[PDB]
Write a protein that holds these residues in place. Structure first.
Motif, mmCIF file in Angstrom:
data_model
loop_
_atom_site.group_PDB
_atom_site.id
_atom_site.type_symbol
_atom_site.label_atom_id
_atom_site.label_comp_id
_atom_site.label_asym_id
_atom_site.label_seq_id
_atom_site.Cartn_x
_atom_site.Cartn_y
_atom_site.Cartn_z
ATOM 1 N N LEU B 112 0.880 -1.161 0.000
ATOM 2 C CA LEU B 112 0.000 0.000 0.000
ATOM 3 C C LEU B 112 0.911 1.203 0.000
ATOM 4 C CD1 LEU B 112 -2.876 1.123 0.162
ATOM 5 C CD2 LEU B 112 -2.561 1.265 2.605
ATOM 6 N N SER B 120 -2.398 5.787 -1.573
ATOM 7 C CA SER B 120 -2.384 6.217 -2.961
ATOM 8 C C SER B 120 -2.598 5.078 -3.943
ATOM 9 C CB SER B 120 -1.057 6.902 -3.289
ATOM 10 O OG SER B 120 -0.061 5.923 -3.537
ATOM 11 N N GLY B 121 -1.997 3.909 -3.702
ATOM 12 C CA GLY B 121 -2.202 2.787 -4.608
ATOM 13 C C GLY B 121 -1.775 1.491 -3.956
ATOM 14 N N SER B 136 7.085 0.686 -6.847
ATOM 15 C CA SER B 136 6.797 1.998 -7.412
ATOM 16 C C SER B 136 6.604 2.922 -6.207
ATOM 17 C CB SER B 136 5.574 1.960 -8.312
ATOM 18 O OG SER B 136 5.551 3.090 -9.162
ATOM 19 N N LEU B 138 7.776 6.899 -4.593
ATOM 20 C CA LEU B 138 8.323 8.237 -4.811
ATOM 21 C C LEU B 138 8.722 8.880 -3.483
ATOM 22 C CD1 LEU B 138 5.614 9.469 -7.269
ATOM 23 C CD2 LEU B 138 7.837 8.426 -7.928
#
Ligand SMILES: *[C@](O)(C(=O)NCc1ccccc1)[C@H](C[C@@H]1CCNC1=O)NC(=O)[C@H](CC(C)C)NC(=O)OCc1ccccc1
Ligand SMILES: *[C@](O)(C(=O)NCc1ccccc1)[C@H](C[C@@H]1CCNC1=O)NC(=O)[C@H](CC(C)C)NC(=O)OCc1ccccc1
Lengths: 299, 297
Positions: B112, B120-121, B136, B138
């Motif tokens: 998560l 966020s995703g 992924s 950031l």
């Protein structure tokens, strides 16, 4: 770049099961209404060519078993809207998020919360193919599972699952019960049109490659939209719409590459091939990342 | 398709943690918030942080924890390896049944990804054999967690700390011990040589058969050791007898002996895919376990 789904919790809080007789599928509980595929009211015999209006007249509120987990939700009204059944219940879902019902266009992506007996099993990211099917993992029991996007705090529901086609792909409706594509909810043999490549997403992928410094394929030329579309169709690519051009706007601004210049670069890739080179570490062009998906993961 | 666990039970645990100008995510379980200890670093500190020394200089009130619009008061803190544990004065009512586990290379989990305490995703990852993960993530994603769900129990296995120069990721278990030879200092770190998770490639090949795809099958077979010789030559992990056992269900389901699938994989490694694709992919996928495949078929 990963296939990344939206966090599923706001949707998990809306999943229920709906049973008629021995037929159980999933439903979506928002405020005091539960939405589910109307074929919950079918027996196996009805499913070959159901008369849904006649089947529904024979039903009463007390024929529907709605459960959130093992807790029954009393049905106090029922109606059919296209291919979805709406069951009014006597309790407003306290976990109802801010939500919208939206009808997406082919090429758009969304997350699916795959559910069985009202219990979530997994979440994954799907693209609506141009032939209005999705390539998903749906087993018996998954009908009524929904697809969605989340914008800020607001869940936009766009898909409800109904069926599997002979080829293994899946078909369904929006939350107003209107099928995507030419399909009908009968247990009859039906065929999806030949599929095509989602041009706007391939373009988004090329923009992503540029953003990451992989830009060998940029050429010095441009094209008109009409000339690109006529070429693209000879390679089984979708034609672009004005809306596609517009949703590429942010990536075109981020990179300084006009949409139609990127179209000309793609056209050259289609006409000449990759010549053994790769883009983002792949010799295949990816078509299931939308321009929004690209923005999400890069920024 | 690559499927993640539903993330709701983890979303209800994510919070924001701030110290100085550094903000990242924490995991709020009962009355404790877990987060990466480097939240206490500054620009200067990051290159060679003496964490016990930096931490003894902090007070409870130097930590700002926010659950949505509400600030949670820190009433105590301690450090366990690379994780900081902040005791707060209120319990999280959304705390699921949970455990902390340390996963093995080749196992998969869901991530998560969160920023400023907000989900966020979600996506599925595998612990690589070189103890990186291809995520992924950031700026701001540190403190995001990885997990599996069994029954109603969340098994947390990963907290995010670092992006290597190659773009892969490194982090810890929830006891704060890194997976791999990595260190939470602001330095360019390389991983060991990665290898491919062979038992997972085999599960993925079986999945492709189940979905009516078998152009890569062949009439040949191979012994386990002869397959492993070739695998190791191509930087694939060796296949153990427990791997073969674990693949039984998929072998039964399809009528394809494990070692027959090994012979097909051998052929693919030596020849390649000759332009073809398997389940849409130009490359052999190694981030589905046999369990992942079985559950989804
Ligand atoms: C959906 O109706 C569903 O999941 N129902 C609950 C259920 C519970 C126990 C056994 C079966 C079903 C179902 C979803 C399908 C099944 C397999 N994969 C899917 O996506 N949908 C249907 O069965 C369709 C209903 C009609 C009225 C549209 N029929 C359908 O998909 O036709 C083809 C087909 C292919 C494979 C298996 C079953 C049906
Ligand atoms: C993580 O610390 C984080 O998300 N912090 C909050 C933050 C960071 C930056 C701006 C605002 C808020 C961060 C996660 C990284 C960043 C990019 N993608 C990621 O997954 N982790 C780090 O920055 C590491 C901190 C150390 C102290 C553990 N640093 C790091 O990854 O360095 C890699 C590196 C590469 C080359 C040279 C030197 C270091």
């Amino acid at each position: 770049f990963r296939k990344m789904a939206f966090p599923s919790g706001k949707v998990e809080g809306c999943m229920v099961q709906v049973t008629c007789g021995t037929t159980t599928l999933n439903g979506l509980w928002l405020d005091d209404v539960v939405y589910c595929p109307r074929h919950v009211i079918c027996t196996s015999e009805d499913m070959l060519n159901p008369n849904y209006e006649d089947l529904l007249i024979r039903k009463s509120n007390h024929n529907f078993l709605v459960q959130a987990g093992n807790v029954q939700l009393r049905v106090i009204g029922h109606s059919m809207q296209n291919c979805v059944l709406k069951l009014k219940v006597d309790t407003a879902n306290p976990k109802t998020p801010k939500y919208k019902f939206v009808r997406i266009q082919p090429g758009q992506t969304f997350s699916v919360l795959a559910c069985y007996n009202g219990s979530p099993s997994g979440v994954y990211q799907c693209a609506m193919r141009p032939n209005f099917t999705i390539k998903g993992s749906f087993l018996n029991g998954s009908c009524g599972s929904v697809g969605f996007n989340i914008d800020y705090d607001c869940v936009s529901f766009c898909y409800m699952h109904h069926m599997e086609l002979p080829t293994g792909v899946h078909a369904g409706t929006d939350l107003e019960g209107n099928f995507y594509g030419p399909f009908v909810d009968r247990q009859t043999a039906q065929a999806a049109g030949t599929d095509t490549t989602i041009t706007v997403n391939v373009l988004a992928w090329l923009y992503a490659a540029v953003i990451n410094g992989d830009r060998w394929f940029l050429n010095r030329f441009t094209t008109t939209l009409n000339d690109f579309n006529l070429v693209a169709m000879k390679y089984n690519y979708e034609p672009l719409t004005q809306d596609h051009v517009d949703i590429l706007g942010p990536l075109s601004a981020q990179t300084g590459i006009a949409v139609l210049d990127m179209c000309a670069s793609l056209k050259e890739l289609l006409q000449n091939g990759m010549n053994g080179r790769t883009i983002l570490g792949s010799a295949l062009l990816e078509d299931e990342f939308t321009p929004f998906d690209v923005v999400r993961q890069c920024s």
